Amino acid sequence: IIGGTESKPHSRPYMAYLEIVTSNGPSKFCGGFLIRRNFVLTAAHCAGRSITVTLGAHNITEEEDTWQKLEVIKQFRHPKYNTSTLHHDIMLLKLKEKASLTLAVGTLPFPSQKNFVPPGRMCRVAGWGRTGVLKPGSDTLQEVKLRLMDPQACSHFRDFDHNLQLCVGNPRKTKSAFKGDSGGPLLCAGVAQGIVSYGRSDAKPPAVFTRISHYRPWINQILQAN
Ligand SMILES: Cc1c([C@@H](C2=C(O)[C@@H](Cc3ccccc3)OC2=O)c2ccccc2)[nH]c2ccc(F)cc12
Ligand SMILES: [Cl-]
Numbered sequence: 457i458i459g460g461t462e463s464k465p466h467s468r469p470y471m472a473y474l475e476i477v478t479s480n481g482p483s484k485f486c487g488g489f490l491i492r493r494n495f496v497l498t499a500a501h502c503a504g505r506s507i508t509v510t511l512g513a514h515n516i517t518e519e520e521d522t523w524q525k526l527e528v529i530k531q532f533r534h535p536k537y538n539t540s541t542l543h544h545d546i547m548l549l550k551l552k553e554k555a556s557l558t559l560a561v562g563t564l565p566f567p568s569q570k571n572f573v574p575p576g577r578m579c580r581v582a583g584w585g586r587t588g589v590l591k592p593g594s595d596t597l598q599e600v601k602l603r604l605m606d607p608q609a610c611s612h613f614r615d616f617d618h619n620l621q622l623c624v625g626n627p628r629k630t631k632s633a634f635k636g637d638s639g640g641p642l643l644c645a646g647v648a649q650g651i652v653s654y655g656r657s658d659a660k661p662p663a664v665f666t667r668i669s670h671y672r673p674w675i676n677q678i679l680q681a682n
């Protein structure tokens with residue numbers, strides 16, 4: 457998160473810190489969010505050979521009793537996910553066991569309503585990602601308030617599509633999600649409307665988020681079948 461503030465510790469108890477293992481390079485990092493006691497929603501490009509989920513974190517370098525380090529049994533990448541266009545950058549992680557509910561760990565279930573969110577309002581995104589182009593990921597959970605933009609603001613992302621994705625972050629500000637934040641939720645009025653997907657390598661906003669409303673049927677399908 458660039459240009460944000462440190463979150464109040466444990467104030468976003470659904471936040472998940474993902475460490476992504478691959479057979480041929482070191483760990484990579486993403487965010488995600490707990491939507492059922494045994495399911496974390498994140499981005500498909502965060503898939504790997506294996507993934508560890510840490511719930512209950514604030515400062516990820518300091519182990520504490522609120523931590524729940526949970527095994528992932530299976531990754532459910534969207535079946536139409538495209539590694540070239542980044543369309544359908546959404547994935548569900550099934551946890552081996554159900555998380556414990558604590559003050560610091562809880563789910564963020566969707567409301568029944570799945571209305572299309574138009575441009576204009578302010579939303580918030582949180583993550584442990586990089587706080588600048590030349591900076592490491594934040595030790596502490598950070599968050600930032602970002603403007604939902606008209607889709608034309610993301611036209612330069614030639615594979616952006618308004619029906620599938622939200623365009624997030626006024627280009628007049630430095631505020632943005634960035635590397636390490638992928639998979640985290642964008643909340644608008646306390647409801648998860650987006651998932652951090654991708655943006656420019658130089659962190660200039662806007663960035664592209666998966667539009668959750670479009671994927672509600674698929675999410676429901678996976679959750680009912682597993
Ligand atoms: C440039 C960018 C990214 C890319 C990225 C990650 O997600 C992490 C972990 C990782 C690394 C390598 C491979 C997979 C994951 O390191 C990265 O370099 C990325 C990689 C791949 C696809 C799509 C985006 N995420 C963003 C989020 C918001 C934003 F404004 C810009 C970006
Ligand atoms: Cl802010």
Ligand SMILES: [Cl-]
Binds near residue numbers: 612613656
């Ligand atoms: Cl570009």
Ligand SMILES: [Cl-]
Binds near residue numbers: 643646
């Ligand atoms: Cl919020």
Ligand SMILES: [Zn+2]
Binds near residue numbers: 465466514520522
């Ligand atoms: Zn704590």
